[PDB]
Amino acid sequence: SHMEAVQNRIVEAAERVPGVRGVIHLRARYVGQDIWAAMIIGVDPENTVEQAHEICEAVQAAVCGKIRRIESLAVSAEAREIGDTTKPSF
Amino acid sequence: GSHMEAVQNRIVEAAERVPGVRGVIHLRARYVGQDIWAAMIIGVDPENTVEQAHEICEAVQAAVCGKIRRIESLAVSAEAREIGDTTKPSF
């Protein structure tokens, strides 16, 4: 819950990137005042593997751009169906 | 860790038989208790769909977990790999 606000900022940043259907999972830790994090995003299942990689790169740039305290971020992509409203796991 | 090395090679060989696997990019394996927990990244055609790539991952899981009894957990994820790429698996 001391992680809560920052996790929500990261999710919100990622979810405003074109091609992102939602964030599936986010592992984030503080190390001092820097953040290290790994995120799984959901994308159209009919995107190609190369398309999905591009969206992952876009999320990395956007999230790091908005949340400057992030020192390291990994992003990976999995299939998500268009009406899935399942909340992110943390 | 010659014994774990041996196990790793057996996982790679089982994975690389699976249709759609261009090669294993990465494998991390370790004992958690007396079982093995492992995570592997496989290389696949970049033109696969995400859902296609997932099925290949599930095919690999079934194949590996069927040959190596001691693996309790195996996570498999897919990344783009070009067809003539030669880089061997990393550990």
Numbering used by the authors:
A (entry chain B): 212 to 301
B (entry chain A): 211 to 301
What does the article say, verbatim?
One of the most highly conserved and abundant integral MM proteins is the CDF transporter MamM. MamM was recently proposed to function as a magnetosome-directed iron transporter required for iron biomineralization since its deletion abolished magnetite biomineralization and mutation of residues within the conserved TMD metal-binding site resulted in alterations of magnetite crystal size, morphology and even mineral phase.
Although the average particle number per cell was almost identical between the D249A and the D249A + H285A strains, the latter strain produced particles with significantly reduced mean diameters (−12%, P<0.001, Mann-Whitney test). In addition, this strain also showed a slower restoration of its magnetic response upon induction of biomineralization by adding iron back to iron-starved cells. (ii) All mutants exhibited an apo-MamM CTD-like behavior along the MD simulations, and (iii) an absence of structural differences was observed.
